[PDB]
Structures are given as structure tokens and as C-alpha cells.
């Protein structure tokens, strides 16, 4: 009975409530209904990030990027994953890619991406 859009919307409301494993499951139901929508994977990847499930977030970012090569959030969440796994060069490049795509796409996330790039470059440096 529930549409994939419906299920995604439910996931988003769970995400607002900080119920991440639940939210991730709803996105999983969204995928079950339509597995060709990158947002579903991008949305679940963020859930996994919040759950410190980095391997799973990576896999989702990859699935999203196969469906949408222009995905800002897939590149950003990938970068944040790799950062938390001490893969700085790749992380910085992916955050930088996100910055570029968001400019190209007229998306406003305030100072979130530059802030993240600073965090990444600083952490990388703090490890020399």
C-alpha cells in the first residue's frame, strides 16, 4: 500500500526524531518499491553515518553515484565517510567535488561544505 515517496517521507520524519535505524529501514522499503532512485541510498547512507556504520554508508554512496553522478550529498557523505576512516586525500577531493557540484547546481548549504573541508584538511595535517 505505501508508495516509495510515502516511505521516504516517513524515513525523513524518523530521521527528524533521531530514529536512524528505523529511518534507514523505511528507505530500504522505498528501495524495495523503486531501487532506481539515488536519493533513497543517499538518505540511508546518512542514517548509517549517524550510526557510525561507515562501510554500509560507503556502499550506499556508491549505489547512489551509479544512479546520479551529479549527486552533491552522495559525494559529501562519501567524503565524510572516508574522513572518519582516515582517508583524507580522497575525502577532501569528494568534499571539493560536492562544493563544485552545489555551485554548478545553485544549491545553498551555507558554510557546511567549506567547514567540512577545513575539518578534513586540519585532521589530515594533525596526522601530517
Amino acid at each position: 500500500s505505501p508508495s516509495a515517496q510515502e516511505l521516504k517521507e516517513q524515513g525523513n520524519r524518523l530521521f527528524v526524531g533521531r530514529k536512524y535505524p528505523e529511518a534507514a529501514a523505511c528507505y530500504g522499503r522505498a528501495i524495495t518499491r523503486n531501487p532506481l532512485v539515488a536519493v533513497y541510498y543517499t538518505n540511508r547512507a546518512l542514517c548509517y553515518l549517524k550510526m557510525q556504520q561507515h562501510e554500509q554508508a560507503l556502499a550506499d554512496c556508491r549505489r547512489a553515484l551509479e544512479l546520479d553522478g551529479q549527486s552533491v550529498k552522495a559525494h559529501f557523505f562519501l567524503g565524510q565517510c572516508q574522513l572518519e576512516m582516515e582517508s583524507y586525500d580522497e575525502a577532501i577531493a569528494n568534499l571539493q567535488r560536492a562544493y563544485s557540484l552545489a555551485k554548478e547546481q545553485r544549491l545553498n548549504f551555507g558554510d557546511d561544505i567549506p567547514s567540512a573541508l577545513r575539518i578534513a584538511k586540519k585532521k589530515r595535517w594533525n596526522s601530517i
Partner: peptide
């Protein structure tokens, strides 16, 4: 264009 937090689902 409204500023929005990036660590949010779409």
C-alpha cells in the same frame, strides 16, 4: 535560495 543543512535527507 534558502540555506539548508547538508546533513539532512532529501
Amino acid at each position: 535560495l534558502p540555506k539548508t543543512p547538508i546533513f539532512r535527507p532529501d
